[PDB]
Design a protein around this motif. Structure first.
Motif, PDB file in Angstrom:
ATOM      1  N   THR A  47       0.851  -1.180   0.000  1.00 45.27           N
ATOM      2  CA  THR A  47       0.000   0.000   0.000  1.00 45.27           C
ATOM      3  C   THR A  47       0.887   1.230   0.000  1.00 45.27           C
ATOM      4  OG1 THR A  47      -1.868  -1.049   1.126  1.00 45.27           O
ATOM      5  CG2 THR A  47      -1.738   1.338   1.222  1.00 45.27           C
ATOM      6  N   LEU A  48       0.736   2.067  -1.019  1.00 50.87           N
ATOM      7  CA  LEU A  48       1.579   3.243  -1.151  1.00 50.87           C
ATOM      8  C   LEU A  48       0.891   4.500  -0.640  1.00 50.87           C
ATOM      9  CD1 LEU A  48       3.118   2.700  -4.707  1.00 50.87           C
ATOM     10  CD2 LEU A  48       4.313   2.500  -2.502  1.00 50.87           C
ATOM     11  N   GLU A  49       1.658   5.296   0.091  1.00 46.52           N
ATOM     12  CA  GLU A  49       1.243   6.619   0.500  1.00 46.52           C
ATOM     13  C   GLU A  49       1.891   7.617  -0.447  1.00 46.52           C
ATOM     14  OE1 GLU A  49      -1.068   5.928   2.974  1.00 46.52           O
ATOM     15  OE2 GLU A  49      -1.584   7.749   1.850  1.00 46.52           O
ATOM     16  N   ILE A  50       1.113   8.167  -1.373  1.00 46.78           N
ATOM     17  CA  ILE A  50       1.688   9.039  -2.399  1.00 46.78           C
ATOM     18  C   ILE A  50       1.768  10.485  -1.916  1.00 46.78           C
ATOM     19  CG2 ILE A  50       1.340  10.031  -4.682  1.00 46.78           C
ATOM     20  CD1 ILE A  50       0.598   7.485  -5.767  1.00 46.78           C
ATOM     21  N   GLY A  51       0.710  10.952  -1.265  1.00 43.03           N
ATOM     22  CA  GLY A  51       0.743  12.250  -0.622  1.00 43.03           C
ATOM     23  C   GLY A  51      -0.027  13.311  -1.372  1.00 43.03           C
ATOM     24  N   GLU A  52       0.380  14.564  -1.186  1.00 36.96           N
ATOM     25  CA  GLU A  52      -0.265  15.704  -1.829  1.00 36.96           C
ATOM     26  C   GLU A  52       0.119  15.813  -3.300  1.00 36.96           C
ATOM     27  OE1 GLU A  52       1.011  19.459  -0.279  1.00 36.96           O
ATOM     28  OE2 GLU A  52       3.131  18.908  -0.203  1.00 36.96           O
ATOM     29  N   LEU A  53      -0.875  16.050  -4.148  1.00 34.88           N
ATOM     30  CA  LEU A  53      -0.646  16.211  -5.582  1.00 34.88           C
ATOM     31  C   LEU A  53      -1.529  17.316  -6.151  1.00 34.88           C
ATOM     32  CD1 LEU A  53      -0.500  12.501  -6.864  1.00 34.88           C
ATOM     33  CD2 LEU A  53       1.435  14.004  -6.403  1.00 34.88           C
ATOM     34  N   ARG A  54      -0.963  18.146  -7.018  1.00 34.73           N
ATOM     35  CA  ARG A  54      -1.776  19.136  -7.707  1.00 34.73           C
ATOM     36  C   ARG A  54      -2.624  18.443  -8.770  1.00 34.73           C
ATOM     37  NH1 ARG A  54      -1.517  25.068  -8.673  1.00 34.73           N
ATOM     38  NH2 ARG A  54       0.427  25.118  -9.892  1.00 34.73           N
ATOM     39  N   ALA A  55      -3.583  19.176  -9.323  1.00 37.00           N
ATOM     40  CA  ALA A  55      -4.417  18.646 -10.394  1.00 37.00           C
ATOM     41  C   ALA A  55      -3.557  18.293 -11.599  1.00 37.00           C
ATOM     42  CB  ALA A  55      -5.489  19.651 -10.783  1.00 37.00           C
ATOM     43  N   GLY A  56      -4.077  17.426 -12.462  1.00 36.26           N
ATOM     44  CA  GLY A  56      -3.389  17.077 -13.691  1.00 36.26           C
ATOM     45  C   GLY A  56      -2.794  15.685 -13.667  1.00 36.26           C
ATOM     46  N   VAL A  57      -1.797  15.457 -14.521  1.00 36.20           N
ATOM     47  CA  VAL A  57      -1.207  14.139 -14.704  1.00 36.20           C
ATOM     48  C   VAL A  57       0.069  13.983 -13.879  1.00 36.20           C
ATOM     49  CG1 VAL A  57      -0.187  12.531 -16.411  1.00 36.20           C
ATOM     50  CG2 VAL A  57      -2.197  13.944 -17.010  1.00 36.20           C
ATOM     51  N   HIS A  58       0.228  12.825 -13.253  1.00 36.16           N
ATOM     52  CA  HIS A  58       1.402  12.542 -12.433  1.00 36.16           C
ATOM     53  C   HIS A  58       1.856  11.119 -12.684  1.00 36.16           C
ATOM     54  CE1 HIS A  58       0.940  16.271 -10.170  1.00 36.16           C
ATOM     55  NE2 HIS A  58      -0.336  15.973  -9.992  1.00 36.16           N
ATOM     56  N   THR A  59       3.155  10.873 -12.718  1.00 33.89           N
ATOM     57  CA  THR A  59       3.610   9.500 -12.888  1.00 33.89           C
ATOM     58  C   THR A  59       4.625   9.106 -11.830  1.00 33.89           C
ATOM     59  OG1 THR A  59       5.432  10.019 -14.415  1.00 33.89           O
ATOM     60  CG2 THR A  59       3.246   9.631 -15.388  1.00 33.89           C
ATOM     61  N   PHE A  60       4.712   7.802 -11.580  1.00 29.08           N
ATOM     62  CA  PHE A  60       5.553   7.281 -10.520  1.00 29.08           C
ATOM     63  C   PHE A  60       6.111   5.919 -10.919  1.00 29.08           C
ATOM     64  CE2 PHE A  60       3.792  10.528  -7.735  1.00 29.08           C
ATOM     65  CZ  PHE A  60       2.473  10.646  -8.137  1.00 29.08           C
ATOM     66  N   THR A  61       7.242   5.543 -10.333  1.00 29.16           N
ATOM     67  CA  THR A  61       7.724   4.172 -10.482  1.00 29.16           C
ATOM     68  C   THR A  61       7.863   3.488  -9.123  1.00 29.16           C
ATOM     69  OG1 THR A  61       8.962   4.780 -12.479  1.00 29.16           O
ATOM     70  CG2 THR A  61       9.462   2.645 -11.472  1.00 29.16           C
ATOM     71  N   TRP A  62       7.171   2.367  -8.978  1.00 27.73           N
ATOM     72  CA  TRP A  62       7.233   1.534  -7.781  1.00 27.73           C
ATOM     73  C   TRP A  62       8.558   0.767  -7.755  1.00 27.73           C
ATOM     74  CZ3 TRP A  62       4.708  -3.848  -8.089  1.00 27.73           C
ATOM     75  CH2 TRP A  62       4.794  -4.534  -6.860  1.00 27.73           C
ATOM     76  N   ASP A  63       9.170   0.603  -6.579  1.00 25.29           N
ATOM     77  CA  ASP A  63      10.455  -0.104  -6.504  1.00 25.29           C
ATOM     78  C   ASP A  63      10.300  -1.630  -6.591  1.00 25.29           C
ATOM     79  OD1 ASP A  63       9.482  -0.838  -3.974  1.00 25.29           O
ATOM     80  OD2 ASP A  63      10.934   0.379  -2.871  1.00 25.29           O
ATOM     81  N   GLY A  64       9.057  -2.099  -6.618  1.00 27.72           N
ATOM     82  CA  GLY A  64       8.785  -3.520  -6.751  1.00 27.72           C
ATOM     83  C   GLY A  64       8.959  -4.314  -5.472  1.00 27.72           C
ATOM     84  N   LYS A  65       9.062  -3.618  -4.345  1.00 30.55           N
ATOM     85  CA  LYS A  65       9.209  -4.313  -3.070  1.00 30.55           C
ATOM     86  C   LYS A  65       7.876  -4.390  -2.328  1.00 30.55           C
ATOM     87  CE  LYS A  65      14.011  -2.678  -2.561  1.00 30.55           C
ATOM     88  NZ  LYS A  65      14.687  -3.900  -3.085  1.00 30.55           N
ATOM     89  N   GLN A  66       7.603  -5.546  -1.731  1.00 26.95           N
ATOM     90  CA  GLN A  66       6.416  -5.742  -0.891  1.00 26.95           C
ATOM     91  C   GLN A  66       6.476  -4.974   0.422  1.00 26.95           C
ATOM     92  OE1 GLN A  66       5.990  -9.923  -0.301  1.00 26.95           O
ATOM     93  NE2 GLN A  66       5.260 -10.296  -2.391  1.00 26.95           N
ATOM     94  N   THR A  67       5.371  -5.000   1.159  1.00 26.45           N
ATOM     95  CA  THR A  67       5.285  -4.293   2.434  1.00 26.45           C
ATOM     96  C   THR A  67       6.233  -4.882   3.498  1.00 26.45           C
ATOM     97  OG1 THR A  67       3.808  -3.837   4.331  1.00 26.45           O
ATOM     98  CG2 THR A  67       3.221  -5.692   2.886  1.00 26.45           C
TER      99      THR A  67
END
Length: 132
Positions: free
Chosen positions: A61-81
């Motif tokens: 489960t990822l906590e991404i946080g505050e984001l402005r409107a529009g498009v956002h991209t991210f890369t997960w490190d592939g590690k479990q909790t």
């Protein structure tokens, strides 16, 4: 046609939840995952992402946080909790914010105008949120 054709060979972020995890064939290869995103019409105070495996088990489960409107991209490190790295395979992301459109990575394989994304099927140019 000009605008559709020059996307071939690039990745696009389009609606969907799929993340692929795997390693390169070379010695020392570390697991990497294909980027994901979210489109927000309004800005978000908190953003949460749940990632499941093919059996539907939550592996992170990822906590991404505050984001402005529009498009956002991210890369997960592939590690479990628990810190271990996930097996090669497909994973799915669910995103909630306080409406959210999740975005997944797809490779443009050709055009028909419609983009051929292979496994993901087809999408129109306007559904593309980001080109990579």
């Amino acid at each position: 046609s000009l605008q559709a054709t020059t996307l071939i060979g690039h990745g696009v972020m389009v609606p969907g939840t799929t993340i692929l995890a795997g390693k390169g064939a070379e010695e020392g290869a570390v697991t990497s995952t294909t980027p994901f995103g979210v489109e927000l019409q309004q800005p978000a105070d908190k953003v949460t992402a749940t990632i499941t495996d093919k059996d539907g088990r939550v592996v992170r489960t990822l906590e991404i946080g505050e984001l402005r409107a529009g498009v956002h991209t991210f890369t997960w490190d592939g590690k479990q909790t628990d810190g271990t790295t996930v097996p090669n395979g497909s994973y799915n992301i669910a995103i909630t914010a306080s409406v959210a459109q999740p975005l997944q990575f797809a490779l443009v394989q050709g055009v028909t105008n419609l983009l051929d994304l292979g496994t993901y099927g087809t999408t129109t140019l306007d559904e593309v949120r980001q080109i990579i």
